[PDB]
Structure 1
Amino acid sequence: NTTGGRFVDKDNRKYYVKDDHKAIYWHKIDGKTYYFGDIGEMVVGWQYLEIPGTGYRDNLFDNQPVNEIGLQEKWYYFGQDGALLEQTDKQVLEAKTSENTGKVYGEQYPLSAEKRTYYFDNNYAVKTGWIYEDGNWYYLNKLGNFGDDSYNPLPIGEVAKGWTQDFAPWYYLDASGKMLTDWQKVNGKWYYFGSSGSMATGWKYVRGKWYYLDNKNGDMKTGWQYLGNKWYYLRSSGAMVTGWYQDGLTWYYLNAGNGDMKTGWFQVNGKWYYAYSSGALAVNTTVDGYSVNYNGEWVQ
């Protein structure tokens, strides 16, 4: 693509000069790809740059008009010689930090960070999103942090850990980035991630039992829960109860199918029972005149 010029050392930097003009941005020179930024300085190592190939940031020299278009940006790695790493699969590289990113030929060595595995797309840019590796799903960040002036792209392409949203469904990656599935206890509470990994919220039927995960935060509930102007009792295991349930000495009746707590007179196998407005089963007394025995049965 670019020819007739020659690399030059000057002012502690490396430039590519052709006819007294410093190349800028993306250039392909004799089988290798380089990036010279907005004024010519040759880059090395980790770089967050506008994507190449369009023409708006390619084959340009400081003696030319630069289109105001603001192109998408992604991470790229350049060798210490400024040559782009044309990887389409994976590479072990040092964790992107503030010290080892955006540097240029002529600057001192960064500061060791820690080696990590980075995956790449078919155009040599760091890959983002979900990936399945060695039997597990990992989420490679697609977004950076904050906005405009204080925007931070460092997180992009990194393996996510802990609670993470996918832009929104929530997921939880373990200490090594592994996405959890099914029942998992996190911070002492239970969560159900099903088989796809997305966090369940609200009511969920799992293995023949009903459970209620916080409609917002997803954490499994237990004990008495007032849901939808109805009471339900969830065992310590979280599983919903149906039928008779004794809390202390007080009895309650959870609807045989839906599970909601009953109040008022109700029948169970022909026999009549009465529950107060709190659910407490009436026993050995009279209810509006009708006698109820020790089992709460309406006797004559």
Structure 2
Amino acid sequence: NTTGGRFVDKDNRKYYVKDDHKAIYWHKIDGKTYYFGDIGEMVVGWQYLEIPGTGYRDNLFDNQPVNEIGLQEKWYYFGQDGALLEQTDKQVLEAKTSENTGKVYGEQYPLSAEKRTYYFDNNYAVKTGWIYEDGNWYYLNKLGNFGDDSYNPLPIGEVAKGWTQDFHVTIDIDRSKPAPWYYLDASGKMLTDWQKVNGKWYYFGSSGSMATGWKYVRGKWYYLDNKNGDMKTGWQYLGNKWYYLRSSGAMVTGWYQDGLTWYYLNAGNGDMKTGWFQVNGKWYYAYSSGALAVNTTVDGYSVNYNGEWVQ
């Protein structure tokens, strides 16, 4: 809905001039969309820009006041003629790098030899977050890289690999909502269920989020590191109680012999018993270590080689 002007080539740049004024920011001109920056120079290729459509960065010329406004920035792709690529699905394009973005018409730069598939949202920006493609989940980076002032938006929209936190994010991370961990393999596919990574087991479940703490999977209990997710084995002191986890990770219940020493792990909860306890109508005594007293006396009461109380 911008009309009555014309494109002008001047000083190795391209402008759109109407009634003697230069177009700035976003314009829809004769069925195509262009962006002319803060002083009129038409952009080409990859651009990280304030979102169009509100009116505050739209249909504006450089003789008009430019409002203060807070708008998220997103990645957009423009042709070499300045026309916005109005894609809402996906398209293979030159990879955005440090040397092919923020360019204007008239500027020379190398087209990336590397091409990648970029995904787009319904408003022609590069899509971020979770997408489902041909039977798998992929994560498109919502965030760029930080480095003490050094924000680089380049990784946004790119396929994530490896260990990745899914933050709630608009302009910035919302550090009040949860940010679960995921693991994407070498092609970006989200892993589920049990996976061994850097020598340790993790459980990602059906939804892909990395489990922490206690988790019941296929009829057995496992303990994943409360912070780091890695699966524990052996004896573990958790919540002021000992538990014994097999080499497979599965929690033990009932009687368990470590070397010569017997321990009793509570039938349901799995916690190691100490003191006097009953099992199937028999009395047994475990020391503070968990070790079953056998062939000896305890507070006047004697116990046989099975550890059972004898009258």
1:136 shift after superposition: 0.5
Cα gap change, 1:258 to 1:238, in 2 (>3 Å):
same
Q: What per-residue deviation string (whole Å, max 9, x for no partner) do you get for residues 92-137 of structure 1?
A: 0122211111111111223526211111111111111111101001
- Cα distance in 2 for partners of 1:258, 1:113 equals 59
Cα gap change, 1:70 to 1:269, in 2 (>3 Å):
closer
Task: Give the equivalent residue in structure 2 for 1:56.
Answer: 56
- Cα distance in 1 for partners of 2:111, 2:309 equals 82
- Cα distance in 2 for partners of 1:162, 1:98 equals 23
Q: Which moved more, 1:212-221 or 1:16-25?
A: 16-25
- Cα distance in 2 for partners of 1:115, 1:187 equals 30
- Cα distance in 1 for partners of 2:137, 2:253 equals 37
- Cα distance in 2 for partners of 1:257, 1:29 equals 71
Q: What per-residue deviation string (whole Å, max 9, x for no partner) do you get for residues 56-111 of structure 1?
A: 11121111111111322211100011111011111001222111111111112235
> Is the partner of 2:23 in helix, strand or coil?
strand
Residues 209 and 240 in structure 1, CA contact (< 8 A), matched pair in contact too: yes
Tell me the TM-score normalized by structure 1: 0.95
Q: How many positions carry a matched residue from both structures?
A: 300
* 2:85 is the alignment partner of 1:85: yes
Q: What per-residue deviation string (whole Å, max 9, x for no partner) do you get for residues 12-57 of structure 1?
A: 2111222332211111222211111001111111101111122111
- Cα distance in 2 for partners of 1:147, 1:24 equals 32
1:164 shift after superposition: 1.5
Q: Which moved more, 1:151-160 or 1:111-120?
A: 111-120
> Is the partner of 1:125 in helix, strand or coil?
coil
- Cα distance in 1 for partners of 2:213, 2:70 equals 43
Q: RMSD of the TM alignment (CA)?
A: 1.7
Q: Which moved more, 1:101-110 or 1:249-258?
A: 101-110
- Cα distance in 2 for partners of 1:212, 1:153 equals 37
- Cα distance in 1 for partners of 2:209, 2:148 equals 30
Residues 96 and 113 in structure 1, CA contact (< 8 A), matched pair in contact too: no
Q: Which moved more, 1:131-140 or 1:93-102?
A: 93-102
Residues 94 and 111 in structure 2, CA contact (< 8 A), matched pair in contact too: no
Stretches of structure 2 that go unaligned for 5 or more consecutive residues are 168-178
- Cα distance in 2 for partners of 1:113, 1:189 equals 38
- Cα distance in 1 for partners of 2:159, 2:209 equals 17
Q: Which moved more, 1:195-204 or 1:230-239?
A: 195-204
Q: Which moved more, 1:282-291 or 1:226-235?
A: 282-291
Q: What per-residue deviation string (whole Å, max 9, x for no partner) do you get for residues 183-220 of structure 1?
A: 11111111111111111111111111111111121111
1:147 shift after superposition: 8.3
Stretches of structure 1 that go unaligned for 5 or more consecutive residues are none
Residues 234 and 240 in structure 1, CA contact (< 8 A), matched pair in contact too: yes
1:182 shift after superposition: 1.0
Q: Which moved more, 1:225-234 or 1:168-177?
A: 168-177
> Is the partner of 2:149 in helix, strand or coil?
helix
Residues 99 and 111 in structure 1, CA contact (< 8 A), matched pair in contact too: no
Residues 27 and 34 in structure 1, CA contact (< 8 A), matched pair in contact too: yes
1:145 shift after superposition: 3.1
1:5 shift after superposition: 2.2
Residues 34 and 84 in structure 1, CA contact (< 8 A), matched pair in contact too: yes
- Cα distance in 1 for partners of 2:308, 2:158 equals 65
Residues 99 and 109 in structure 2, CA contact (< 8 A), matched pair in contact too: no
1:248 shift after superposition: 1.2
Residues 97 and 113 in structure 1, CA contact (< 8 A), matched pair in contact too: no
Cα gap change, 1:186 to 1:48, in 2 (>3 Å):
same
1:6 shift after superposition: 2.1
> Is the partner of 1:150 in helix, strand or coil?
coil
- Cα distance in 2 for partners of 1:275, 1:25 equals 77
Report the identity percentage: 100
Alignment map for 1:252-291 (pairs within 5 Å): 252-291=263-302
- Cα distance in 1 for partners of 2:150, 2:203 equals 36
Residues 266 and 272 in structure 2, CA contact (< 8 A), matched pair in contact too: yes
